Structure 1
Amino acid sequence: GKCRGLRTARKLRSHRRDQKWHDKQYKKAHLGTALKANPFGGASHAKGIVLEKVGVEAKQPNSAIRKCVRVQLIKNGKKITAFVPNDGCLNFIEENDEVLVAGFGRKGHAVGDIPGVRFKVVKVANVSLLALYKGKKERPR
């Protein structure tokens, strides 16, 4: 601190209270602009209906097509490109399926090669995409 007087506790507490708002991690939590902008809304997962399967070109040096999925959520109606992680797991996903969609692990940030995808697909029609990949469960038909 700078003002060290013995009865300056309102000068100090109201200066941390002012200057906490210049912290980027603090203001995002304590303004409602970022919770409104979050397509989940302070949730960790969201079911959503697939409406098309989208190929996303990767960024710089990496040259690949990232196999993503245009998801429209149930709870909001908001539209989202979510990612499909493992190899060949886009073929399990048919159109018009309720898929469970998580984050990517970076708390609202684009991750790695993919430009502007914040979300990945966990389950495909109440069957996990891991068990579809491994072969433990089968797509229910």
Structure 2
Amino acid sequence: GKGKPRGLNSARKLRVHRRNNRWAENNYKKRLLGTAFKSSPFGGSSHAKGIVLEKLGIESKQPNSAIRKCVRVQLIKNGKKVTAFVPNDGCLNFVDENDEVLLAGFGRKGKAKGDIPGVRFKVVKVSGVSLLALWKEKKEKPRS
């Protein structure tokens, strides 16, 4: 009878067995245990501002070979320590030490992107003046 019970009165044994085997998914176990808010530095959010401590240069994973130019960020809302990629040609000169950056996930919902070991966040804005709009020429950083 191919495993499962088929009967009319067996709606519970099917429904119990579904919830039992529902936990082996990746999203249902994450959503129902609430690990987005408990773990996971951006506590369920999409963007989190933080304070720049440091400018790290992370080595790219083999077989790639480059220095990836991240920064180290303590989150304002949480106090947790994260490493944040600074994406473009240049743009590490645009951040600073000790000023505010708006971050984001990088795009793999965790799961550090590609050759970049452990770095799973990037930088959207610095000083609220938007790295991409700084990188082109469009905006100027606030001086003081």
| TM-score interval (norm. to shorter) | over 0.9
Q: Which residue of 2 aligns with 1:24?
A: 26
Task: Report the TM-score when normalising by structure 1.
Answer: 0.96
Q: Which residue of 2 aligns with 1:6?
A: 8
Distance in 1 of aligned mates of 2:130 and 2:36: 30
Q: Which residue of 2 aligns with 1:86?
A: 88
User: Residues 1-141 of structure 1 correspond to what in structure 2 (within 5 A)?
Assistant: 2-141=4-143
**Structure 1 residue 139 displacement after superposition:** 1.0
Amino acid at match of 1:24: N
Task: Report the TM-score when normalising by structure 2.
Answer: 0.94
1:99-132, Cα deviation, whole Å (9 max, x unpaired): 0000011101110110001100000001000111
Quick check: 1:29–1:35 contact (8 Å CA) kept in 2? no
1:56 aligned counterpart, secondary structure: coil
**Structure 1 residue 34 displacement after superposition:** 4.7
Amino acid at match of 1:124: V
2:98 aligned counterpart, secondary structure: coil
1:65 aligned counterpart, secondary structure: coil
**Structure 1 residue 24 displacement after superposition:** 2.3
1:106 aligned counterpart, secondary structure: coil
Amino acid at match of 2:139: K
Quick check: 1:82–1:118 contact (8 Å CA) kept in 2? yes
Count of residues paired in the alignment: 141
More strand by share: 1
Two-structure CA RMSD over aligned residues (Å): 1.1
**Structure 1 residue 32 displacement after superposition:** 2.6
Distance in 1 of aligned mates of 2:117 and 2:24: 28
Residue segments in structure 2 that go unaligned for 5+ positions in a row: none
1:39-85, Cα deviation, whole Å (9 max, x unpaired): 01110000000011000001010001000000000000000001000
Amino acid at match of 1:2: K
